[PDB]
Amino acid sequence: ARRRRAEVRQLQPDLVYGDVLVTAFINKIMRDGKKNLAARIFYDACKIIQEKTGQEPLKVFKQAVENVKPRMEVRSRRVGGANYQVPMEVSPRRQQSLALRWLVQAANQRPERRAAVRIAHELMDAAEGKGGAVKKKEDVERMAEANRAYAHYRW
Amino acid sequence: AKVKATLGEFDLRDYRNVEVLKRFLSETGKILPRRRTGLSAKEQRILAKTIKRARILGLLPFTEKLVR
Amino acid sequence: QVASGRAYIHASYNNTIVTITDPDGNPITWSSGGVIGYKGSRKGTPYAAQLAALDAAKKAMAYGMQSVDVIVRGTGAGREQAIRALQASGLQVKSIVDDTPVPHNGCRPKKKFR
RNA sequence: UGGGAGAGGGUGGUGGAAUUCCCGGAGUAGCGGUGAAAUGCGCAGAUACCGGGAGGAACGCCGAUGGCGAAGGCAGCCACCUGGUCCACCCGUGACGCUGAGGCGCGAAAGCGUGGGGAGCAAACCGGAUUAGAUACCCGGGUAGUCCACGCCCUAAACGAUGCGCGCUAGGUCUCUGGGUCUCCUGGGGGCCGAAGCUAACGCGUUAAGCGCGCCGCCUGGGGAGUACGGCCGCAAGGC
Ligand SMILES: [Mg+2]
Ligand SMILES: [Mg+2]
Ligand SMILES: [Mg+2]
Ligand SMILES: [Mg+2]
Ligand SMILES: [Mg+2]
Ligand SMILES: [Mg+2]
Ligand SMILES: [Mg+2]
Ligand SMILES: [Mg+2]
Ligand SMILES: [Mg+2]
Ligand SMILES: [Mg+2]
Ligand SMILES: [Mg+2]
Ligand SMILES: [Mg+2]
Ligand SMILES: [Mg+2]
Ligand SMILES: [Mg+2]
Ligand SMILES: [Mg+2]
Ligand SMILES: [Mg+2]
Ligand SMILES: [Mg+2]
Ligand SMILES: [Mg+2]
Ligand SMILES: [Mg+2]
Ligand SMILES: [Mg+2]
Ligand SMILES: [Mg+2]
Ligand SMILES: [Mg+2]
Ligand SMILES: [Mg+2]
Ligand SMILES: [Mg+2]
Ligand SMILES: [Mg+2]
Ligand SMILES: [Mg+2]
Ligand SMILES: [Mg+2]
Ligand SMILES: [Mg+2]
Ligand SMILES: [Mg+2]
Ligand SMILES: [Mg+2]
Ligand SMILES: [Mg+2]
Ligand SMILES: [Mg+2]
Ligand SMILES: [Mg+2]
Ligand SMILES: [Mg+2]
Ligand SMILES: [Mg+2]
Ligand SMILES: [Mg+2]
Ligand SMILES: [Mg+2]
Ligand SMILES: [Mg+2]
Ligand SMILES: [Mg+2]
Ligand SMILES: [Mg+2]
Ligand SMILES: [Mg+2]
Ligand SMILES: [Mg+2]
Ligand SMILES: [Mg+2]
Ligand SMILES: [Mg+2]
Ligand SMILES: [Mg+2]
Ligand SMILES: [Mg+2]
Ligand SMILES: [Mg+2]
């Protein structure tokens, strides 16, 4: 807000992987403050991304995450009388947030019926470079590229 | 770095003294202000008037291109 | 084909144009914000000018250009960036001189310039 | 008598920068313009670039919080013709002074007449936008006019909103231009802060709006109205 830069909340590490990054992904799945249900679905996905592909879920998950991180985004700023889509770098804190949110949102677009499955399948295709989350990243990345001419309007 | 200092006894009214005068022009050709020339009020006018005279005579430039 | 030549930059508030000529002064190739692909106000931007000087250098190199002398005219906001693009292009930049035309109180300007 | 400073004024010459148009070379896909656009211009070769030619207008740096003039106002450079003014010397004249109803001249810009000139700019006008509309503001065009000569007009926030001359009433500081012995002193201009005093306050204050004398002009609630009638001036617009 106005006064001072607020403090970032560090999440209590997950009990299956001891990972602060995994905890975040969990919370974005959490509807209605029902974390336990969100815990299953994600861990269930760890089960699924093991069966349909014999390797470490944490390795699947984390690599999938990196492939969704946008390095450049466009933030609107109506200078003069027109709305300019100013290109901006994305801080790692936001790169994390946007990748995770999109990753879960991309999951909820898929046609597979169980939540456990979708999370797996998106995380599966994400590390392999596909999936709606990576589609959104590439989009937002080209938009900032397209508007490279407004580099001098950056804050 | 006042130019009036860096020269001996010299004539302001002398419009043919190209070597003295050329010191009073900027690298871009413009006549230098008092804050750079160190001349008093009265001297400046005599200087300016003769510098212009010389420019007509081909001894001094009216303008020079700015090199970097 | 010419090794040494000239690099003229006409950069105004609305656009930046770059023309590469031979030492005699005959243009060899040229570019601008429109040539790079931009329209409207985007032509005046520094990034536009950057692309302009490059496409002007790229085409120039293809005809044997190696050395250039950069002549600058206009006080646009894309000016200095054009200079940057020519140096980092692969061209020699043996000199850079600003030669913007300034009258000695010649003609009366338009209304917007008084 | 001797000296100085200055865009004071008039006439004739003349120098470069830039804009425009035209000719040549070279070159290609756009240029221009805006908040963003469009009108517009461009493959019938534009823009941008180099060379040449033509023409008009204004004089960048110097340039200043500067200088000059009674005001309007005056700025590249040269020469001629010409006004005002300041200093020093303390030589000449012997009150020859000050103001000034009428009168006379001068009087920015726009405007008018006759004839030139016409690059840029630009009332009117055309177009493109904006907008509810946009007879505007912004953009592309554009005719008078802006320039010269001669003759008219005679208005204004023609302002310091402060009539002219003179004497007297602390100083401090910046500046221009003279003269001394040049530390500085002494004149004449240009600002700032201020003694006393003034003033309704704001502010003025040796450049008075202080204290005094002389002369002229002017005011007497707001509107109606700088209108009407009359008169004088003007080609008219219109002015008094
Ligand atoms: Mg998404
Ligand atoms: Mg001499
Ligand atoms: Mg433009
Ligand atoms: Mg005399
Ligand atoms: Mg041609
Ligand atoms: Mg030319
Ligand atoms: Mg000036
Ligand atoms: Mg005597
Ligand atoms: Mg006697
Ligand atoms: Mg009198
Ligand atoms: Mg009278
Ligand atoms: Mg008049
Ligand atoms: Mg007139
Ligand atoms: Mg007329
Ligand atoms: Mg006329
Ligand atoms: Mg007629
Ligand atoms: Mg005529
Ligand atoms: Mg014309
Ligand atoms: Mg219209
Ligand atoms: Mg309309
Ligand atoms: Mg209507
Ligand atoms: Mg217009
Ligand atoms: Mg026009
Ligand atoms: Mg007419
Ligand atoms: Mg007429
Ligand atoms: Mg008429
Ligand atoms: Mg006046
Ligand atoms: Mg005034
Ligand atoms: Mg006065
Ligand atoms: Mg009055
Ligand atoms: Mg009054
Ligand atoms: Mg009077
Ligand atoms: Mg002296
Ligand atoms: Mg004084
Ligand atoms: Mg005062
Ligand atoms: Mg007092
Ligand atoms: Mg009184
Ligand atoms: Mg009070
Ligand atoms: Mg005083
Ligand atoms: Mg006085
Ligand atoms: Mg009073
Ligand atoms: Mg009454
Ligand atoms: Mg009355
Ligand atoms: Mg009347
Ligand atoms: Mg009247
Ligand atoms: Mg009458
Ligand atoms: Mg009157």
UniProtKB/Swiss-Prot annotation, chain A:
PANTHER family: RIBOSOMAL PROTEIN S7. The gene is rpsG. Part of the 30S ribosomal subunit. Contacts proteins S9 and S11. One of its GO terms (cellular component) is small ribosomal subunit. GO terms for molecular function: rRNA binding; structural constituent of ribosome; tRNA binding. It comes from Thermus thermophilus (strain ATCC BAA-163 / DSM 7039 / HB27). Keywords: Ribonucleoprotein, Ribosomal protein, RNA-binding, rRNA-binding, tRNA-binding. GO terms for biological process: translation. InterPro entries: Ribosomal_uS7, Ribosomal_uS7_bac/org-type, Ribosomal_uS7_CS, Ribosomal_uS7_dom, Ribosomal_uS7_dom_sf. Belongs to the universal ribosomal protein uS7 family. This is Small ribosomal subunit protein uS7. Coiled coil: none annotated. It holds the Pfam family Ribosomal_S7. One of the primary rRNA binding proteins, it binds directly to 16S rRNA where it nucleates assembly of the head domain of the 30S subunit. Is located at the subunit interface close to the decoding center, probably blocks exit of the E-site tRNA. The keyword Ion transport does not apply. Transmembrane segments: none annotated. NCBIfam families: rpsG_bact (TIGR01029).
Swiss-Prot record, chain B:
The chain holds residues 20 to 87 of 88 of the full protein. GO terms for molecular function: small ribosomal subunit rRNA binding; structural constituent of ribosome. It comes from the Bacteria. It comes from Thermus thermophilus (strain ATCC BAA-163 / DSM 7039 / HB27). Part of the 30S ribosomal subunit. Forms a tight heterodimer with protein bS6. Keywords: Ribonucleoprotein, Ribosomal protein, RNA-binding, rRNA-binding. The gene is rpsR. Belongs to the bacterial ribosomal protein bS18 family. GO terms for cellular component: ribonucleoprotein complex; ribosome. One of its GO terms (biological process) is translation. Disulfide bonds: none annotated. Binds as a heterodimer with protein bS6 to the central domain of the 16S rRNA, where it helps stabilize the platform of the 30S subunit. This is Small ribosomal subunit protein bS18.
UniProtKB/Swiss-Prot annotation, chain C:
GO terms for biological process: translation. PROSITE patterns: RIBOSOMAL_S11. InterPro entries: Ribosomal_uS11, Ribosomal_uS11_bac-type, Ribosomal_uS11_CS, Ribosomal_uS11_sf. It comes from the Bacteria. GO terms for cellular component: ribonucleoprotein complex; ribosome. Keywords: Ribonucleoprotein, Ribosomal protein, RNA-binding, rRNA-binding. Belongs to the universal ribosomal protein uS11 family. NCBIfam families: PRK05309.1, uS11_bact. This is Small ribosomal subunit protein uS11. It comes from Thermus thermophilus (strain ATCC BAA-163 / DSM 7039 / HB27). The gene is rpsK.
